Design a binder for this molecule. Structure first.
Ligand SMILES: OC[C@H]1O[C@](O)(CO)[C@@H](O)[C@@H]1O
Ligand SMILES: OC[C@H]1O[C@](O)(CO)[C@@H](O)[C@@H]1O
Ligand code: NA
Length: 493
Protein backbone atom coordinates (compact mmCIF):
# COMPACT_ATOMS: atom_id res chain seq x y z
CA UNK A 1 0.00 0.00 0.00
CA UNK A 2 3.06 1.76 -1.01
CA UNK A 3 4.53 -0.49 1.68
CA UNK A 4 2.31 -3.54 2.08
CA UNK A 5 0.97 -2.07 5.33
CA UNK A 6 4.18 -3.28 7.13
CA UNK A 7 3.99 -2.27 10.79
CA UNK A 8 6.91 -0.01 11.67
CA UNK A 9 7.34 -1.08 15.36
CA UNK A 10 5.51 -4.41 15.66
CA UNK A 11 7.05 -7.79 14.65
CA UNK A 12 6.06 -9.38 11.37
CA UNK A 13 7.82 -12.33 9.71
CA UNK A 14 10.58 -11.31 7.37
CA UNK A 15 8.40 -13.04 4.72
CA UNK A 16 5.18 -14.99 4.51
CA UNK A 17 2.58 -15.96 7.12
CA UNK A 18 2.70 -16.12 10.91
CA UNK A 19 0.16 -17.42 13.40
CA UNK A 20 0.56 -17.64 17.15
CA UNK A 21 3.90 -17.23 18.97
CA UNK A 22 5.65 -20.39 20.28
CA UNK A 23 8.34 -21.23 22.81
CA UNK A 24 8.58 -17.73 24.31
CA UNK A 25 11.77 -17.75 26.49
CA UNK A 26 14.49 -15.42 27.81
CA UNK A 27 18.03 -16.83 27.60
CA UNK A 28 20.72 -14.64 29.12
CA UNK A 29 20.14 -11.13 27.85
CA UNK A 30 18.29 -12.49 24.78
CA UNK A 31 14.47 -12.66 24.45
CA UNK A 32 13.57 -15.55 22.12
CA UNK A 33 10.46 -15.45 19.93
CA UNK A 34 9.28 -18.43 17.93
CA UNK A 35 6.00 -18.61 16.12
CA UNK A 36 3.89 -20.74 13.79
CA UNK A 37 5.28 -19.98 10.33
CA UNK A 38 3.81 -20.80 6.89
CA UNK A 39 6.58 -20.02 4.32
CA UNK A 40 4.33 -21.34 1.48
CA UNK A 41 2.08 -18.34 2.07
CA UNK A 42 -1.24 -20.04 1.15
CA UNK A 43 -3.71 -21.92 3.37
CA UNK A 44 -2.39 -25.34 2.43
CA UNK A 45 1.26 -24.73 3.37
CA UNK A 46 3.16 -26.75 5.96
CA UNK A 47 3.74 -25.20 9.43
CA UNK A 48 7.21 -24.90 11.08
CA UNK A 49 8.59 -22.83 14.03
CA UNK A 50 9.96 -19.46 12.80
CA UNK A 51 12.51 -17.70 15.06
CA UNK A 52 13.61 -14.15 15.96
CA UNK A 53 15.59 -12.62 18.88
CA UNK A 54 16.13 -9.29 20.57
CA UNK A 55 17.71 -7.75 23.64
CA UNK A 56 14.79 -5.31 24.17
CA UNK A 57 11.49 -7.04 23.02
CA UNK A 58 11.38 -4.51 20.15
CA UNK A 59 14.36 -4.75 17.76
CA UNK A 60 13.96 -8.22 16.38
CA UNK A 61 16.62 -10.10 14.47
CA UNK A 62 15.21 -12.67 12.10
CA UNK A 63 16.64 -16.22 12.41
CA UNK A 64 16.29 -19.33 10.21
CA UNK A 65 13.47 -21.84 10.86
CA UNK A 66 14.10 -23.39 14.29
CA UNK A 67 11.87 -26.48 14.09
CA UNK A 68 11.20 -27.63 10.54
CA UNK A 69 8.30 -29.59 9.23
CA UNK A 70 9.83 -32.90 8.13
CA UNK A 71 8.78 -36.34 6.93
CA UNK A 72 5.13 -35.42 6.73
CA UNK A 73 5.13 -33.98 10.24
CA UNK A 74 4.42 -30.23 10.67
CA UNK A 75 5.63 -28.48 13.82
CA UNK A 76 2.58 -27.15 15.55
CA UNK A 77 2.46 -24.91 18.57
CA UNK A 78 4.23 -25.46 21.90
CA UNK A 79 6.33 -23.83 24.62
CA UNK A 80 9.97 -23.88 25.91
CA UNK A 81 11.83 -24.18 29.23
CA UNK A 82 15.41 -24.49 30.66
CA UNK A 83 16.52 -27.82 32.05
CA UNK A 84 19.39 -26.58 34.35
CA UNK A 85 19.86 -30.06 36.01
CA UNK A 86 19.96 -31.84 32.61
CA UNK A 87 17.01 -33.98 33.85
CA UNK A 88 16.49 -34.84 30.12
CA UNK A 89 20.13 -35.97 29.70
CA UNK A 90 20.12 -34.19 26.32
CA UNK A 91 22.87 -31.76 27.32
CA UNK A 92 25.64 -32.20 29.96
CA UNK A 93 26.77 -30.54 33.21
CA UNK A 94 28.81 -27.94 31.27
CA UNK A 95 25.72 -26.81 29.42
CA UNK A 96 22.32 -28.08 30.51
CA UNK A 97 19.91 -27.95 27.58
CA UNK A 98 17.13 -25.53 26.68
CA UNK A 99 13.98 -27.46 25.70
CA UNK A 100 10.97 -26.98 23.35
CA UNK A 101 7.93 -29.27 23.28
CA UNK A 102 5.69 -29.05 20.20
CA UNK A 103 2.77 -30.87 18.68
CA UNK A 104 3.70 -33.00 15.68
CA UNK A 105 0.96 -32.92 13.10
CA UNK A 106 1.04 -35.71 10.51
CA UNK A 107 -0.58 -33.94 7.55
CA UNK A 108 -1.89 -37.07 5.78
CA UNK A 109 -3.51 -38.79 8.76
CA UNK A 110 -4.18 -35.55 10.82
CA UNK A 111 -2.81 -37.13 14.04
CA UNK A 112 -1.47 -34.89 16.76
CA UNK A 113 1.32 -36.16 19.04
CA UNK A 114 3.76 -34.46 21.35
CA UNK A 115 7.44 -33.97 20.37
CA UNK A 116 10.68 -32.59 21.85
CA UNK A 117 13.56 -30.51 20.57
CA UNK A 118 16.68 -29.30 22.44
CA UNK A 119 19.37 -26.66 22.11
CA UNK A 120 22.81 -26.70 23.66
CA UNK A 121 24.03 -23.42 22.08
CA UNK A 122 21.67 -21.29 24.22
CA UNK A 123 18.72 -21.31 21.76
CA UNK A 124 20.63 -20.64 18.52
CA UNK A 125 19.94 -24.04 16.97
CA UNK A 126 17.46 -26.73 17.79
CA UNK A 127 17.62 -30.51 17.46
CA UNK A 128 14.58 -32.81 17.43
CA UNK A 129 14.80 -35.53 20.05
CA UNK A 130 15.61 -38.90 18.45
CA UNK A 131 12.90 -40.67 20.54
CA UNK A 132 10.09 -38.45 19.11
CA UNK A 133 7.11 -38.46 19.73
CA UNK A 134 7.48 -38.31 23.50
CA UNK A 135 3.65 -38.80 23.81
CA UNK A 136 2.18 -41.00 21.08
CA UNK A 137 -1.44 -41.06 19.80
CA UNK A 138 -1.63 -44.41 21.67
CA UNK A 139 -0.88 -42.67 24.98
CA UNK A 140 -3.31 -39.88 24.18
CA UNK A 141 -6.27 -42.08 23.13
CA UNK A 142 -7.59 -42.89 26.65
CA UNK A 143 -7.85 -39.11 27.08
CA UNK A 144 -8.75 -37.97 23.58
CA UNK A 145 -12.00 -39.37 22.13
CA UNK A 146 -10.76 -38.72 18.58
CA UNK A 147 -8.03 -41.26 19.37
CA UNK A 148 -5.22 -38.70 18.95
CA UNK A 149 -6.39 -36.09 16.45
CA UNK A 150 -7.20 -33.53 19.20
CA UNK A 151 -4.33 -33.21 21.71
CA UNK A 152 -2.04 -30.26 21.19
CA UNK A 153 -0.21 -27.09 22.19
CA UNK A 154 1.87 -28.41 25.12
CA UNK A 155 2.64 -25.86 27.84
CA UNK A 156 5.56 -27.31 29.92
CA UNK A 157 7.19 -25.99 33.07
CA UNK A 158 9.11 -27.42 36.02
CA UNK A 159 7.07 -27.62 39.18
CA UNK A 160 9.41 -26.95 42.15
CA UNK A 161 6.98 -27.82 44.95
CA UNK A 162 6.55 -31.35 43.55
CA UNK A 163 9.87 -31.98 41.75
CA UNK A 164 8.24 -32.90 38.37
CA UNK A 165 7.91 -31.52 34.86
CA UNK A 166 4.24 -30.60 34.19
CA UNK A 167 2.73 -30.74 30.71
CA UNK A 168 -0.62 -29.05 29.99
CA UNK A 169 -2.30 -30.19 26.75
CA UNK A 170 -5.34 -28.72 25.03
CA UNK A 171 -8.17 -30.80 23.56
CA UNK A 172 -10.07 -28.58 21.15
CA UNK A 173 -13.84 -29.17 21.04
CA UNK A 174 -13.61 -31.60 23.98
CA UNK A 175 -13.38 -28.33 26.01
CA UNK A 176 -10.71 -29.47 28.46
CA UNK A 177 -6.97 -29.37 29.21
CA UNK A 178 -5.06 -32.45 30.46
CA UNK A 179 -2.23 -32.42 33.05
CA UNK A 180 0.67 -34.82 32.69
CA UNK A 181 3.83 -35.29 34.85
CA UNK A 182 7.38 -36.41 33.99
CA UNK A 183 10.78 -36.61 35.77
CA UNK A 184 12.93 -36.61 32.64
CA UNK A 185 10.86 -34.45 30.11
CA UNK A 186 10.48 -37.52 27.85
CA UNK A 187 8.30 -40.09 29.70
CA UNK A 188 4.95 -38.67 30.61
CA UNK A 189 2.06 -39.77 32.77
CA UNK A 190 -1.49 -38.42 32.64
CA UNK A 191 -2.74 -37.05 36.00
CA UNK A 192 -5.97 -35.12 35.40
CA UNK A 193 -8.29 -33.24 33.09
CA UNK A 194 -9.55 -29.67 33.77
CA UNK A 195 -12.97 -29.66 32.04
CA UNK A 196 -15.24 -26.71 31.18
CA UNK A 197 -18.05 -28.36 33.21
CA UNK A 198 -15.90 -28.19 36.29
CA UNK A 199 -15.21 -24.44 36.16
CA UNK A 200 -17.89 -22.44 37.97
CA UNK A 201 -19.05 -19.43 35.93
CA UNK A 202 -17.54 -20.54 32.61
CA UNK A 203 -20.13 -20.42 29.83
CA UNK A 204 -20.93 -23.36 27.48
CA UNK A 205 -20.31 -21.06 24.57
CA UNK A 206 -16.57 -21.16 25.32
CA UNK A 207 -15.38 -24.00 23.16
CA UNK A 208 -12.31 -25.12 21.12
CA UNK A 209 -9.60 -24.89 23.80
CA UNK A 210 -6.10 -24.14 22.39
CA UNK A 211 -2.76 -22.55 23.31
CA UNK A 212 -2.54 -23.04 27.12
CA UNK A 213 0.00 -21.20 29.22
CA UNK A 214 0.53 -21.61 32.96
CA UNK A 215 2.52 -19.63 35.55
CA UNK A 216 2.41 -17.99 39.03
CA UNK A 217 1.38 -14.30 39.37
CA UNK A 218 1.87 -12.06 42.41
CA UNK A 219 -1.61 -11.05 43.51
CA UNK A 220 -1.18 -7.50 43.75
CA UNK A 221 1.29 -6.54 45.96
CA UNK A 222 0.36 -8.79 48.87
CA UNK A 223 3.18 -11.31 49.31
CA UNK A 224 0.75 -14.07 48.21
CA UNK A 225 0.89 -15.56 44.66
CA UNK A 226 -1.66 -17.54 42.63
CA UNK A 227 -1.56 -19.97 39.71
CA UNK A 228 -2.85 -18.64 36.36
CA UNK A 229 -3.89 -20.66 33.39
CA UNK A 230 -4.29 -18.66 30.24
CA UNK A 231 -5.67 -20.12 26.94
CA UNK A 232 -7.24 -19.22 23.60
CA UNK A 233 -10.60 -20.85 23.11
CA UNK A 234 -11.86 -20.76 19.52
CA UNK A 235 -15.33 -19.43 20.43
CA UNK A 236 -16.95 -17.12 22.95
CA UNK A 237 -14.85 -13.98 23.07
CA UNK A 238 -16.32 -10.45 23.62
CA UNK A 239 -15.77 -9.45 19.94
CA UNK A 240 -16.86 -12.89 18.85
CA UNK A 241 -14.70 -15.79 17.76
CA UNK A 242 -11.35 -16.80 19.10
CA UNK A 243 -10.09 -14.98 22.19
CA UNK A 244 -7.71 -14.96 25.09
CA UNK A 245 -8.83 -15.56 28.66
CA UNK A 246 -7.19 -16.24 32.02
CA UNK A 247 -8.38 -18.14 35.12
CA UNK A 248 -6.82 -18.23 38.65
CA UNK A 249 -6.72 -21.26 40.98
CA UNK A 250 -4.51 -23.69 42.97
CA UNK A 251 -2.16 -26.36 41.65
CA UNK A 252 -0.75 -29.35 43.57
CA UNK A 253 1.50 -30.84 40.84
CA UNK A 254 -1.26 -33.08 39.48
CA UNK A 255 -4.45 -31.14 39.09
CA UNK A 256 -5.61 -27.51 38.77
CA UNK A 257 -8.52 -26.22 40.88
CA UNK A 258 -10.00 -23.12 39.33
CA UNK A 259 -11.43 -20.22 41.30
CA UNK A 260 -14.94 -19.16 40.37
CA UNK A 261 -14.59 -17.17 37.16
CA UNK A 262 -16.36 -13.98 36.28
CA UNK A 263 -17.08 -13.41 32.58
CA UNK A 264 -16.61 -9.64 33.10
CA UNK A 265 -12.99 -10.04 34.16
CA UNK A 266 -11.65 -13.27 32.56
CA UNK A 267 -10.99 -12.06 28.95
CA UNK A 268 -7.67 -10.41 28.22
CA UNK A 269 -8.86 -8.46 25.13
CA UNK A 270 -12.20 -7.23 23.81
CA UNK A 271 -11.10 -6.69 20.21
CA UNK A 272 -10.95 -9.19 17.32
CA UNK A 273 -7.17 -9.45 16.88
CA UNK A 274 -5.32 -10.79 19.93
CA UNK A 275 -5.27 -14.62 19.98
CA UNK A 276 -2.83 -17.50 20.93
CA UNK A 277 -1.08 -15.52 23.70
CA UNK A 278 1.96 -16.97 25.48
CA UNK A 279 4.30 -15.52 28.14
CA UNK A 280 8.08 -15.33 28.26
CA UNK A 281 9.42 -17.92 30.70
CA UNK A 282 12.77 -17.87 32.51
CA UNK A 283 12.61 -14.14 33.15
CA UNK A 284 15.06 -13.35 35.99
CA UNK A 285 13.51 -12.32 39.31
CA UNK A 286 15.16 -8.83 39.20
CA UNK A 287 12.93 -8.17 36.21
CA UNK A 288 10.08 -10.31 37.54
CA UNK A 289 7.46 -9.24 34.93
CA UNK A 290 4.86 -11.47 33.34
CA UNK A 291 5.05 -10.41 29.69
CA UNK A 292 2.64 -11.81 27.04
CA UNK A 293 2.30 -11.53 23.27
CA UNK A 294 -0.19 -12.98 20.75
CA UNK A 295 -0.83 -12.85 17.00
CA UNK A 296 -3.11 -10.10 15.65
CA UNK A 297 -4.99 -11.58 12.69
CA UNK A 298 -8.39 -13.20 13.28
CA UNK A 299 -9.07 -13.20 9.47
CA UNK A 300 -6.84 -16.09 8.16
CA UNK A 301 -5.69 -15.20 4.60
CA UNK A 302 -8.03 -12.21 4.15
CA UNK A 303 -5.79 -9.26 5.39
CA UNK A 304 -4.86 -7.22 2.24
CA UNK A 305 -1.15 -7.80 2.67
CA UNK A 306 0.98 -9.71 0.20
CA UNK A 307 4.62 -10.23 1.21
CA UNK A 308 3.63 -11.10 4.84
CA UNK A 309 0.47 -11.92 6.94
CA UNK A 310 0.01 -11.89 10.74
CA UNK A 311 1.70 -9.49 13.12
CA UNK A 312 2.78 -9.91 16.73
CA UNK A 313 0.96 -7.69 19.31
CA UNK A 314 3.22 -5.25 21.15
CA UNK A 315 4.51 -7.06 24.26
CA UNK A 316 2.55 -6.15 27.36
CA UNK A 317 2.76 -7.01 31.04
CA UNK A 318 0.01 -9.01 32.73
CA UNK A 319 -0.76 -8.44 36.46
CA UNK A 320 -3.49 -8.91 39.03
CA UNK A 321 -4.46 -5.71 40.87
CA UNK A 322 -7.33 -3.93 42.53
CA UNK A 323 -9.11 -1.40 40.41
CA UNK A 324 -11.74 0.02 42.78
CA UNK A 325 -12.28 -3.02 45.03
CA UNK A 326 -12.46 -5.55 42.12
CA UNK A 327 -9.32 -7.53 41.35
CA UNK A 328 -8.68 -7.34 37.61
CA UNK A 329 -6.17 -8.75 35.21
CA UNK A 330 -4.41 -5.65 34.09
CA UNK A 331 -2.24 -5.10 30.96
CA UNK A 332 0.13 -2.30 29.88
CA UNK A 333 2.67 -2.05 27.08
CA UNK A 334 6.13 -2.82 28.33
CA UNK A 335 8.10 0.17 29.59
CA UNK A 336 10.75 -0.48 26.91
CA UNK A 337 8.36 1.24 24.46
CA UNK A 338 9.10 4.58 26.26
CA UNK A 339 12.73 4.33 25.02
CA UNK A 340 11.75 4.41 21.34
CA UNK A 341 9.10 7.13 21.40
CA UNK A 342 9.25 10.94 21.25
CA UNK A 343 6.61 13.55 22.10
CA UNK A 344 5.19 15.41 19.19
CA UNK A 345 2.48 17.13 21.25
CA UNK A 346 1.81 17.42 25.01
CA UNK A 347 -1.27 19.03 26.64
CA UNK A 348 -1.67 19.70 30.41
CA UNK A 349 -4.94 20.86 32.03
CA UNK A 350 -6.68 21.85 28.89
CA UNK A 351 -10.38 22.22 28.63
CA UNK A 352 -12.13 20.76 25.62
CA UNK A 353 -15.67 21.83 24.65
CA UNK A 354 -18.10 20.77 21.96
CA UNK A 355 -17.03 22.40 18.73
CA UNK A 356 -13.23 22.30 19.26
CA UNK A 357 -10.93 19.80 17.47
CA UNK A 358 -7.59 19.31 19.19
CA UNK A 359 -4.39 17.54 17.79
CA UNK A 360 -5.11 18.77 14.24
CA UNK A 361 -1.49 19.46 13.34
CA UNK A 362 -0.24 15.91 14.06
CA UNK A 363 0.81 13.66 11.14
CA UNK A 364 1.88 10.07 11.82
CA UNK A 365 1.03 6.45 11.22
CA UNK A 366 3.17 5.19 14.22
CA UNK A 367 1.92 6.89 17.44
CA UNK A 368 1.51 6.15 21.14
CA UNK A 369 -1.04 8.63 22.45
CA UNK A 370 -2.07 8.85 26.10
CA UNK A 371 -5.14 10.84 27.15
CA UNK A 372 -6.17 11.33 30.81
CA UNK A 373 -9.35 13.39 31.41
CA UNK A 374 -12.18 14.41 33.77
CA UNK A 375 -15.24 14.21 31.65
CA UNK A 376 -18.55 15.99 32.21
CA UNK A 377 -21.55 13.78 33.13
CA UNK A 378 -23.14 12.59 29.87
CA UNK A 379 -20.14 13.67 27.77
CA UNK A 380 -18.62 11.47 25.04
CA UNK A 381 -14.86 11.97 24.37
CA UNK A 382 -13.71 10.89 20.94
CA UNK A 383 -10.14 10.34 19.68
CA UNK A 384 -10.06 9.64 15.91
CA UNK A 385 -6.72 8.01 14.85
CA UNK A 386 -5.37 7.30 11.31
CA UNK A 387 -7.64 10.12 10.07
CA UNK A 388 -7.88 11.21 6.43
CA UNK A 389 -10.53 12.66 4.09
CA UNK A 390 -13.14 9.85 4.50
CA UNK A 391 -11.20 7.52 6.83
CA UNK A 392 -10.84 7.31 10.64
CA UNK A 393 -10.72 4.78 13.49
CA UNK A 394 -12.54 6.30 16.44
CA UNK A 395 -11.89 5.60 20.09
CA UNK A 396 -14.78 6.90 22.31
CA UNK A 397 -15.36 7.08 26.02
CA UNK A 398 -19.08 7.29 26.82
CA UNK A 399 -19.28 8.61 30.38
CA UNK A 400 -22.93 7.71 30.99
CA UNK A 401 -22.49 3.97 30.52
CA UNK A 402 -18.75 3.79 31.35
CA UNK A 403 -17.87 2.19 27.93
CA UNK A 404 -14.60 2.33 26.03
CA UNK A 405 -15.40 1.72 22.33
CA UNK A 406 -13.31 1.27 19.14
CA UNK A 407 -15.20 1.95 15.93
CA UNK A 408 -13.84 0.63 12.62
CA UNK A 409 -16.87 1.36 10.40
CA UNK A 410 -14.75 3.95 8.56
CA UNK A 411 -11.15 2.71 9.09
CA UNK A 412 -10.34 2.24 5.40
CA UNK A 413 -10.38 -1.15 3.73
CA UNK A 414 -12.95 -3.13 5.70
CA UNK A 415 -14.04 -5.15 2.61
CA UNK A 416 -11.42 -7.94 3.13
CA UNK A 417 -13.52 -9.76 5.77
CA UNK A 418 -17.08 -9.49 7.16
CA UNK A 419 -15.66 -8.95 10.66
CA UNK A 420 -13.18 -6.21 9.62
CA UNK A 421 -15.37 -3.27 10.77
CA UNK A 422 -18.07 -2.70 13.37
CA UNK A 423 -17.58 -1.45 16.91
CA UNK A 424 -15.94 -3.20 19.89
CA UNK A 425 -16.50 -2.14 23.48
CA UNK A 426 -15.16 -2.71 26.94
CA UNK A 427 -16.24 -1.63 30.40
CA UNK A 428 -14.17 1.30 31.71
CA UNK A 429 -14.99 3.36 34.87
CA UNK A 430 -13.69 6.69 36.24
CA UNK A 431 -11.20 6.17 39.03
CA UNK A 432 -11.92 7.59 42.55
CA UNK A 433 -10.62 11.04 41.50
CA UNK A 434 -13.01 11.07 38.53
CA UNK A 435 -10.04 10.55 36.12
CA UNK A 436 -10.53 8.42 32.97
CA UNK A 437 -7.28 7.12 31.32
CA UNK A 438 -6.88 5.84 27.75
CA UNK A 439 -3.78 4.88 25.77
CA UNK A 440 -3.63 3.87 22.04
CA UNK A 441 -0.70 2.31 20.23
CA UNK A 442 -1.27 3.15 16.56
CA UNK A 443 0.78 1.46 13.79
CA UNK A 444 0.49 0.95 9.96
CA UNK A 445 -2.34 -1.56 10.21
CA UNK A 446 -3.33 -1.77 13.94
CA UNK A 447 -4.65 -0.23 17.21
CA UNK A 448 -4.12 -1.52 20.66
CA UNK A 449 -6.24 0.47 23.11
CA UNK A 450 -5.73 0.25 26.92
CA UNK A 451 -8.37 1.72 29.40
CA UNK A 452 -7.79 2.79 33.02
CA UNK A 453 -4.95 0.82 34.59
CA UNK A 454 -5.29 -1.75 31.81
CA UNK A 455 -8.53 -3.52 32.97
CA UNK A 456 -9.84 -2.83 29.54
CA UNK A 457 -8.04 -3.68 26.27
CA UNK A 458 -9.18 -3.71 22.65
CA UNK A 459 -6.64 -4.85 19.99
CA UNK A 460 -7.73 -4.68 16.36
CA UNK A 461 -6.26 -4.64 12.80
CA UNK A 462 -7.12 -1.66 10.56
CA UNK A 463 -6.18 -0.90 6.94
CA UNK A 464 -6.26 2.92 6.31
CA UNK A 465 -4.55 4.59 3.31
CA UNK A 466 -1.10 5.81 4.06
CA UNK A 467 -2.29 9.41 3.73
CA UNK A 468 -4.81 8.77 6.55
CA UNK A 469 -2.33 9.97 9.20
CA UNK A 470 -4.18 12.67 11.19
CA UNK A 471 -5.75 12.72 14.67
CA UNK A 472 -8.87 14.53 15.93
CA UNK A 473 -9.74 14.90 19.61
CA UNK A 474 -13.37 16.15 20.17
CA UNK A 475 -16.08 16.05 22.80
CA UNK A 476 -19.89 16.06 22.57
CA UNK A 477 -22.69 16.34 25.15
CA UNK A 478 -20.47 18.07 27.67
CA UNK A 479 -16.98 19.34 28.33
CA UNK A 480 -13.93 17.59 29.58
CA UNK A 481 -10.84 18.79 31.28
CA UNK A 482 -7.82 17.01 29.74
CA UNK A 483 -5.50 16.53 32.59
CA UNK A 484 -2.81 15.23 30.12
CA UNK A 485 -2.41 14.27 26.47
CA UNK A 486 0.97 13.04 25.25
CA UNK A 487 1.02 12.22 21.47
CA UNK A 488 4.32 10.54 20.79
CA UNK A 489 5.78 9.21 17.52
CA UNK A 490 7.34 5.71 17.71
CA UNK A 491 10.41 4.61 15.71
CA UNK A 492 12.69 1.58 15.80
CA UNK A 493 15.15 4.00 14.37
O1 LIG B 1 -1.34 -26.17 17.19
C1 LIG B 1 -1.15 -25.06 16.46
C2 LIG B 1 -2.32 -24.18 16.78
O2 LIG B 1 -2.98 -23.64 15.65
C3 LIG B 1 -4.18 -24.29 15.60
O3 LIG B 1 -4.45 -24.72 14.31
C4 LIG B 1 -5.31 -23.48 16.08
O4 LIG B 1 -6.19 -23.41 15.03
C5 LIG B 1 -4.00 -25.50 16.36
O5 LIG B 1 -3.02 -26.10 15.61
C6 LIG B 1 -3.30 -25.03 17.55
O6 LIG B 1 -4.14 -24.37 18.42
O1 LIG C 1 -4.51 -16.41 9.89
C1 LIG C 1 -3.93 -17.70 9.72
C2 LIG C 1 -2.46 -17.40 9.96
O2 LIG C 1 -1.64 -18.58 9.86
C3 LIG C 1 -0.84 -18.62 8.68
O3 LIG C 1 -1.20 -19.78 7.83
C4 LIG C 1 0.63 -18.84 9.12
O4 LIG C 1 0.94 -19.92 10.05
C5 LIG C 1 -1.11 -17.23 8.04
O5 LIG C 1 -1.98 -17.29 6.91
C6 LIG C 1 -2.04 -16.39 8.90
O6 LIG C 1 -1.54 -15.15 9.45
NA1 NA D 1 -10.00 -13.06 18.38
Amino acid sequence: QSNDYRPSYHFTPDQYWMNEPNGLIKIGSTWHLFFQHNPTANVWGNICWGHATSTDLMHWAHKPTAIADENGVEAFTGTAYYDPNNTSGLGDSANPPYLAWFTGYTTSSQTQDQRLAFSVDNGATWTKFQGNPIISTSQEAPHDITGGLESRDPKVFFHRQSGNWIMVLAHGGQDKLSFWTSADTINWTWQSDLKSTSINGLSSDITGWEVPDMFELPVEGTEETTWVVMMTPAEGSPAGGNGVLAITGSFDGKSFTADPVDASTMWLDNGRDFDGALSWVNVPASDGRRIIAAVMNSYGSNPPTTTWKGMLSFPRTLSLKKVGTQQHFVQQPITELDTISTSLQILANQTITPGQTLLSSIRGTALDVRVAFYPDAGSVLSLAVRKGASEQTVIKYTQSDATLSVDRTESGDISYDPAAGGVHTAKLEEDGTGLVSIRVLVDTCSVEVFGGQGEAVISDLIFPSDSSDGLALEVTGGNAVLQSVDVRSVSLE
